[model samples]
Target: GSHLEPTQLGGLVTDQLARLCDVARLDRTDTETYVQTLATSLGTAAERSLALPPTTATLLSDDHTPVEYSLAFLPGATPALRVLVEPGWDSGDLAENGRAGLRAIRAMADRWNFSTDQLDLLEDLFFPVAPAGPFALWCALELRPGGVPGVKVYLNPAARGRDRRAETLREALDRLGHRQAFAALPPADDYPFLALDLGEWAAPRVKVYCTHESLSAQEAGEYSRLDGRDQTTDFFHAVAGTPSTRRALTCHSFTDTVTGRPSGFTLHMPVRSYVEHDGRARDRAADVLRRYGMDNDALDRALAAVTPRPLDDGVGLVAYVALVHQLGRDPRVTVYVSSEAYAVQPP
Candidate 1:
């Protein structure tokens, strides 16, 4: 007895992938035929494969979004989508949802051939109480036109409870032998998010995410340590926009499991919270893409898949956009869109 249906996010994402395939041209790769089929058939996949919608409501998290649709812009690869989703945001208690979500994760693991060991680790760490803090497990499916699906999973540190959020995070890192690595970085409380890349072609990582209040361009740029001018810093301001630069609040950091050290950092600007309205947010997102030498045409197409409303109507169109920098990788940018499974604002 569940409301398992192909939802708006699923449809919008499928449509977006279909249109992106228009330019990326799926037939160019070895998996061409199969990839193209799956891109469009995502229609039958998630709802059928997992028995839950692709994205969900993270009304509990400050970001207020359970799933985030990110448009990935790397140097050579054509724009692809990296969708972040939680498996059990529906009707269940925290532990119940965690177990239910694990079932869904295992289903994908069987299909994608990724290990759920690290994901299960969190269940072990939290042991008997996965507090349902902001989220339990955040699984990301990487969808590239003409490419096989990729997977990454994120777990919340504060899921045990918020009062001792930072302590729980520290202990979790210590369990991974990341204590020194965790201490090496600039100090901050509330390390809320952690991730592990599982799919083939995805990084084998253990990344911890931290939030900083009153973020600045230089401060955000400092984390990535990327060269070639601070275009990322510029991108930060672009999404931060002029009106609400003060809204810039949080950023991200990553860690390597083998090295037991901090690998890279990310800057996530709440595009909707910082901007005046959706139209500007759209342009700003387009600007970030164009600045990185990516085509904004697909973004326009993706946005159309979501709504028929005028872009100028309101904000919330682009929930969050991130600039990611890993040790041996090029700068990557991702646009996060809200699922709106329920309202994101007060009514």
Candidate 2:
């Protein structure tokens, strides 16, 4: 079932072209001309494929250096198209392959009646070679609600997580289709932990507990290498004594799901720190800044800049503290604590 008619499909291309034109400062008349022409090309494409099955193709460059693009069309209720271009493997020169792949796509654009201006816009957006690395060039053309067509381009993987351990654990969960996993500081102490509502496993419900120490290759790897064994027990046992006041700590041992024997406890500790509300710690941070000769106004700003957060990992906490420490040595230095930290402080 086709989701978009010609008019709706045309609007998607029109919107994208207008946006690109505005960014490039291309003439308004040129943008209108492109919308009119490309709309027909899109209509023609749909008309040609009305009765035929979905089409797929892999376009390769003349040099054959593996700068290849695979394109596919889906003609179901949600009509859409996709193209993934890989400019050789990581072993080869990524920059050269990226350029070559871009060139190949431009050539295809010409055959599809894409104007010089459109080609220029695409080239400017995607052909940057320096930041190029082992990323695949991918794009998708799809119809939204009310039959509006739109194209989304993905060039690189966006980074997440504050530290390598957190990143590794989060990525592992992500691979297992759990993207909502996140980290926070220990509610009782200053330690950090990653939490996830992993739904059900063994019991009616199972929540994943990953502490900062668990971010190591050995511990984090266990989540990835879950071969249906009781590996998670060790993580639970290691941090059993340190109970969190906010959340129920799984301190008591549990019967193994498979073995039916007493196993380690699976704690549900508090993920956020409650100590950030303590006025003394925030005042301590503020007083440290004031002793270094900051005026009342400047002192307020510096204190506001480095506001202590409840979920401050070691890295971020150290960074905030270090900025304040550097102020005496460097005249140009200034630290701004979080405004929330001082909002409740007695002036």
Candidate 3:
């Protein structure tokens, strides 16, 4: 799944994911056990924060998947699913979105992992920049039984109503002691995206995302660590002809609650932008799964569960597929799909 494609419209995407999770059968989690709970939770988040229904955008491509959902297959066969919802709230302003997002986090108190130390700390550090404007929230729901979702709060670098986004991010990184690694990053017009990972975990992470055109993948290899570059080549090979894979990255560097010195690098390819339709996109993604030994059969089985229409009926099921290199050690792959709330993209 690469970029925005078609909107599967119905609850097919979630049900499709449910079947995929159940069929794949990962350790300690399965869809059958938690589907209902997850659906309810996602629905609530949509209503509380996005003011929309709990619908997702998914993909089906031979060249790429263009949905809003991204699912990662970790080392040791660990499967993690990430769902990004961009429900436009014209009625509410930016500050309201932030407030609602916090409330969304608070509502999950029972399921939340740690006390609010990291969260409270983040609020203090970043709230100064929350001057208003559009913000996107992505929820990572591990069907390992929806227990709780990892909430990723996306913010603009110029969010403080000033041009000090770079300074603030660097300051936050310095505060986290990860400023050392931020030094060598290539320059960009605006660092644009900053995300906070608030989920079931001990170490809090604040990720700095940059979209650098001048930085080539080869050069990025030097930064993200070669181990990641080593395995990620296969992903590039999988979608080589696509345009998104060519540039340096819509990349993100991680700064955490634990260690400093830069931990990992992740690059996202809007795979659909390069492909024709969903059927073709699925083929391309299947190629990626096979290359990475990620379980192409499992993907097929999942697709079989919910795809009632032909893949090419109108693309846009898979959104983005990312390559994550943690400490340049494990090369993880993820797919983003289910992008549309309505049946089509413009709807």
Candidate 4:
């Protein structure tokens, strides 16, 4: 009950914030169901202990706008007792809201004796869309395990999937809830189609990754639209021959519970994949070397042979790959890839 509530909150925040930017009209979806479900569950739990109920939960968004926040209750019906706690941000669109919200919250922070020590467990939010747009603001309270509490308005309808058949994590969960759903994991053996060598492009810079769980051919196609089809082609051909390989790719990419755009890449290798090995492959893991050579050293040496591209250019390469796969609208999540990664020669 409280679970879906976060999703609704996330959608609401994204849409409303988008309007503040005048970028686009937000999707007006329903949050009443989530609110009702949460209120019902927590309301039932609280009825047993006191004159009024105190409940706790998070507010999350299902789209590329990744946000997770908490909510709490007050003894009296006074709604002002609810304080929005989060890591907070500087002056931005949402930050302005944060300035007003946090200051207002601070007045009540000590009323509940909230100290930084109690809030260490809360999620650390990074505000990319600052000053306004989609972002987070917070205030901590000492009463609950998860301590930031507040009411947030978000984009409506949320961001929609490009394809009619495309499924978001919420949709997938809804489908699974209808019956006894089981997952079928494909074996890794089928990945023999492409001979993957270490990519030459490596740097301690922002490398954007797509969502592995929501990856699709159509999504891939959309991603590739911005750039050409080169990177996307590499993926399709890699696992084409083996059903197990296809399944492994899906297992690595799709079927996972992670959300956001691309919905698949983060599920596999690191966003900024490192070249070093925790454990060297003695078997098929070495197969990455079968065509090129063995060890990160070889990959490193090959990578050293190539000229490094600027971070923006690298993002462009990865972004193009996603576009080919139809994940055009997906916001690229950046990770730091090390410069040690080398380019492996294609066999």
lDDT of model number 4: 0.24
Model number with the top TM-score: 1
- Count of backbone clashes, every candidate in sequence: 1, 11, 49, 55
lDDT of 1 by residue, 1-347 (tens): 11233444344334444444454444545234333333322322334333243243354334343445667777656667555656665535667556655766677778657776665655665534547465666667676544556666667666766776776767766765566666655545456667666665333456666666566677666655525237767876777764323334334344454654566667777777766777888888888888787767767766665555677776786777777766677777777665443343321
lDDT of the candidates, in the order given: 0.59, 0.29, 0.53, 0.24
Candidate 1: 10-residue stretch with minimal lDDT: 37-46
TM-score of each: 0.77, 0.21, 0.73, 0.19
lDDT of candidate 2 over 1-347, digit per residue (tens): 13334233234334443443333233566545444433343333223322332121212222211111111111111111111223222223445444543544344355443333422333422344453333434323222222222332333221122233344444443443334422321222211222211112323111233334323223322332213223333322222222322222221122222332222222332221323432333333334334434332333322222333332321111112111111112221122122121022222
- TM-score, model 1 to reference: 0.77
Winning model by lDDT: 1
User: How does residue 150 of candidate 3 score in lDDT?
Assistant: 53
Superior candidate under lDDT, 1 versus 4: 1
At residue 327, candidate 1 shows an lDDT of 63
Off by over 4 Å in 4: 1-218, 224-228, 239-347
Better of 1 and 2 by TM-score: 1
Please give, for residues 1-347, the per-residue lDDT of candidate 3 as tens digits: 11111232224345555555655564334444344434443433323322244222211222212224556766456356555443222224555545554554555554555455555654644555345343433334444444444566555555565567777667766654566646645565457667666665655576777766544446555556525565565566565453333543546556554434456677666566556776777788777777777766655555555456567765666555678877636677776665334453420
Model 4 over residues 50-84: C-alpha lDDT tens digits? 22211212221111212222211111211111111
Ranking by TM-score: 1, 3, 2, 4
Stretches of candidate 2 off by over 4 Å are 1-83, 87-91, 116-129, 139-153, 156-347
